[PDB]
Enzyme design. Structure first.
Site, PDB file in Angstrom:
ATOM      1  N   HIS A   1       0.758  -1.096  -0.097  1.00  0.00           N
ATOM      2  CA  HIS A   1       0.023  -0.096   0.145  1.00  0.00           C
ATOM      3  C   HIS A   1       0.857   1.153   0.184  1.00  0.00           C
ATOM      4  O   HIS A   1       0.440   2.269  -0.180  1.00  0.00           O
ATOM      5  CB  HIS A   1      -1.048   0.061   1.074  1.00  0.00           C
ATOM      6  CG  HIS A   1      -0.556   0.054   2.507  1.00  0.00           C
ATOM      7  ND1 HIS A   1      -0.108   1.431   3.034  1.00  0.00           N
ATOM      8  CD2 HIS A   1      -0.526  -0.634   3.504  1.00  0.00           C
ATOM      9  CE1 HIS A   1       0.197   1.203   4.309  1.00  0.00           C
ATOM     10  NE2 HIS A   1      -0.128   0.005   4.803  1.00  0.00           N
TER      11      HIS A   1
ATOM     12  N   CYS B   1       3.467   1.618   9.711  1.00  0.00           N
ATOM     13  CA  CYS B   1       3.183   0.559   8.692  1.00  0.00           C
ATOM     14  C   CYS B   1       4.500  -0.077   8.174  1.00  0.00           C
ATOM     15  O   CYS B   1       5.490   0.790   8.034  1.00  0.00           O
ATOM     16  CB  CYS B   1       2.373   0.961   7.420  1.00  0.00           C
ATOM     17  SG  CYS B   1       0.779   1.578   7.744  1.00  0.00           S
TER      18      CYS B   1
ATOM     19  N   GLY C   1       2.296   5.922  10.262  1.00  0.00           N
ATOM     20  CA  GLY C   1       3.493   5.847   9.868  1.00  0.00           C
ATOM     21  C   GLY C   1       4.213   4.574  10.275  1.00  0.00           C
ATOM     22  O   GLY C   1       5.379   4.479   9.971  1.00  0.00           O
TER      23      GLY C   1
HETATM   24  N1  LIG Z   1      -7.042   6.135   8.115  1.00  0.00           N
HETATM   25  C1  LIG Z   1      -5.400   6.115   7.708  1.00  0.00           C
HETATM   26  O1  LIG Z   1      -4.913   6.939   7.934  1.00  0.00           O
HETATM   27  N2  LIG Z   1      -5.036   4.488   7.241  1.00  0.00           N
HETATM   28  C2  LIG Z   1      -5.955   3.784   6.267  1.00  0.00           C
HETATM   29  C3  LIG Z   1      -5.541   2.726   5.853  1.00  0.00           C
HETATM   30  C4  LIG Z   1      -6.199   1.797   5.068  1.00  0.00           C
HETATM   31  C5  LIG Z   1      -5.785   0.711   4.693  1.00  0.00           C
HETATM   32  C6  LIG Z   1      -4.472   0.099   4.928  1.00  0.00           C
HETATM   33 CL1  LIG Z   1      -3.730  -1.263   4.241  1.00  0.00          CL
HETATM   34  C7  LIG Z   1      -3.855   1.134   5.382  1.00  0.00           C
HETATM   35  C8  LIG Z   1      -4.185   2.500   5.996  1.00  0.00           C
HETATM   36  C9  LIG Z   1      -3.256   2.993   7.130  1.00  0.00           C
HETATM   37  C10 LIG Z   1      -3.118   2.687   8.402  1.00  0.00           C
HETATM   38  O2  LIG Z   1      -4.276   2.173   8.732  1.00  0.00           O
HETATM   39  N3  LIG Z   1      -2.269   3.133   8.995  1.00  0.00           N
HETATM   40  C11 LIG Z   1      -2.000   2.880  10.513  1.00  0.00           C
HETATM   41  C12 LIG Z   1      -1.712   1.718  10.949  1.00  0.00           C
HETATM   42  N4  LIG Z   1      -1.573   1.676  12.377  1.00  0.00           N
HETATM   43  C13 LIG Z   1      -2.054   2.634  13.222  1.00  0.00           C
HETATM   44  C14 LIG Z   1      -2.576   3.836  12.556  1.00  0.00           C
HETATM   45  C15 LIG Z   1      -2.946   4.923  13.683  1.00  0.00           C
HETATM   46  C16 LIG Z   1      -3.791   5.832  13.228  1.00  0.00           C
HETATM   47  C17 LIG Z   1      -3.840   6.211  11.611  1.00  0.00           C
HETATM   48  C18 LIG Z   1      -3.130   5.182  10.810  1.00  0.00           C
HETATM   49  C19 LIG Z   1      -2.720   3.935  11.249  1.00  0.00           C
HETATM   50  C20 LIG Z   1      -3.619   4.538   6.757  1.00  0.00           C
END
Ligand SMILES: NC(=O)N1Cc2ccc(Cl)cc2[C@H](C(=O)Nc2cncc3ccccc23)C1
Ligand SMILES: NC(=O)N1Cc2ccc(Cl)cc2[C@H](C(=O)Nc2cncc3ccccc23)C1
Ligand SMILES: [Cl-]
Lengths: 299, 302
Positions: B41, B145, B143
């Site tokens: 992603h 990921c 961030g």
């Molecule tokens: N809403 C948002 O910022 N995301 C949407 C999303 C959708 C699908 C996929 Cl595969 C990845 C993502 C990313 C994700 O989940 N990252 C994040 C990972 N871990 C903790 C987080 C805490 C807070 C914000 C993001 C976190 C980004």
């Protein structure tokens, strides 16, 4: 989201762990530049000057991985033995020796035979013990914090008390607590809860979406401390209130407003509810730990 | 003595963390030999996330579109391929800090250490378990990921998890290092919810055995149970069924403490019925389920 008991990355410390063998005793040492620091009880009513004077450099077998280091000198500083070695540790990080106060937290790299086996987070209890996880051979394992790229060594493990809790020294060999490094009757004093840390953890719960414990009420520092004294909680000082300022501004809940929440939790309990997956009030996260984990500071 | 939630020393993993940048997105990558593994992603925008066609997005990329940074050094990408939900970036330098490693896929109930990273820089290490609903209750911010989950039994690092996303309940979903998601999750911003979580029964039992090894027997009782009666009771408290494999796995701990597995199951049934009554077990007022039988043996014995 999420709140875990998180330790600092142990890598900078792992590259310093060595095995120190002297006589029948084998424990861990911390190799920084050309000195290996370890508990002086490795030479073992112990007269440590008398026991140390009978040892020569070649009596101390220091092993860094599969390499034997040669000891070229030895001296004692309080309860820590300093073994001068011929080789400076090329993995020596930027470091400081710091003495911490009760309530402050740190990461422990538990080691056996100079090999790191685990890393955990813990706090210096108000009674100067640490509720660690150590078995025989763990002596010499170190406690540390990481500030930017500098490792601050704050603890060296020496012994276990009869209640299963642990006692040790700073890296200058000064014990935390009224403990001595010998087989005599020693007991940990009555422990208390680190109040500023519980409040920091309630702020972390609020930041994570848990607000059930919040209330409309406020209290005074004196009225809260009268309640803190009753529930074996450490007194909350104006310094603690100032230190909680950033968290108070971020969540919109004044420190004395969070204190009234804590007061209601102490008198009434959790009532079948949990806070950050815990049925007890957690006191091993400082205000800085909360800010660091709910901001993502890296090392 | 003592029982802590203990993570593996993160050093062998820290020396593999790199920062991967694709356009506006920056996340973490795992540099092992001459390959950087990261969530696919990283090639998406926020809009692309609803229904990304990764093959279509990746075909439009060249090697120089991926900026890989290892410390204060930029690595040169010489190839790229996708394997399930991970992107594998071939780089022109083999990581000299590459430890002995394996890619292992874990089962629910298994534990592992997480080295949480932001911008290719490790910020913390914690222990956690693969929940029965295939999520992990981590501590991750935006961030994070690309942060990895691992175990270090002996001198070999077994990579078992790569963080991809946070679900709406605050829990986390990710993949093994071959890019296969744990759970019925997809790397898409679509409506996804974690299934109802349950307690890892074999882990709670292992933790009760750890409490016995540490001198706490207050919760033991004179009763035993059949495996089936235990499961009928346990299901009512949202506890995972205990299988004969779990009973066999608890064998060493049963022999060490002298408490039969089904006798320990009877203590658990009573604890579920009565609660703790103001008491604690290993400093906890809840029944802890993120220590496996193997973790208990490792920490309590060496
Ligand atoms: N809403 C948002 O910022 N995301 C949407 C999303 C959708 C699908 C996929 Cl595969 C990845 C993502 C990313 C994700 O989940 N990252 C994040 C990972 N871990 C903790 C987080 C805490 C807070 C914000 C993001 C976190 C980004
Ligand atoms: N009786 C006994 O085993 N000791 C006596 C003693 C007396 C003074 C001093 Cl300074 C150290 C010691 C050592 C110590 O406390 N080490 C140990 C440290 N941590 C955990 C242990 C778990 C289990 C056994 C020892 C642990 C060894
Ligand atoms: Cl597994």
């Amino acid at each position: 989201s999420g709140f875990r008991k998180m330790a600092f990355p142990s890598g900078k410390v792992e590259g310093c762990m060595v095995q120190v063998t002297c006589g029948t005793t084998t424990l861990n040492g911390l190799w920084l530049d050309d000195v290996v620091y370890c508990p002086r009880h490795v030479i073992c009513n112990p007269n440590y000057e008398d026991l140390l004077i009978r040892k020569s450099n070649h009596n101390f077998l220091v092993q860094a991985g599969n390499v034997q280091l040669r000891v070229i000198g030895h001296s004692m500083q309080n309860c820590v033995l300093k073994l001068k070695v011929d080789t400076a540790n090329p993995k020596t990080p930027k470091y400081k020796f710091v003495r911490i106060q009760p309530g402050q937290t740190f990461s422990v790299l538990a080691c056996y035979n100079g090999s790191p086996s685990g890393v955990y987070q813990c706090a210096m209890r108000p009674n100067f013990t640490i509720k660690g996880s150590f078995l025989n051979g763990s002596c010499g394992s170190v406690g540390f914090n990481i500030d930017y790229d500098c490792v601050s060594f704050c603890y060296m493990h020496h012994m276990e008390l009869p209640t299963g809790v642990h006692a040790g020294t700073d890296l200058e060999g000064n014990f935390y607590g009224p403990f001595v490094d010998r087989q005599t009757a020693q007991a940990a004093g009555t422990d208390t809860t680190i109040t500023v840390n519980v409040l920091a953890w309630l702020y972390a719960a609020v930041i994570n979406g848990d607000r059930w414990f919040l209330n409309r009420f406020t209290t005074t520092l004196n009225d809260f401390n009268l309640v803190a004294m009753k529930y074996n909680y450490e007194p909350l000082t104006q310094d603690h209130v100032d230190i909680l300022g950033p968290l108070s501004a971020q969540t919109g809940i004044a420190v004395l407003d969070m204190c009234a929440s804590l007061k209601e939790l102490l008198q009434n309990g959790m009532n079948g509810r949990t806070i950050l997956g815990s049925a007890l009030l957690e006191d091993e996260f400082t205000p800085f730990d909360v800010v660091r984990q709910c901001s993502g500071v890296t090392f």
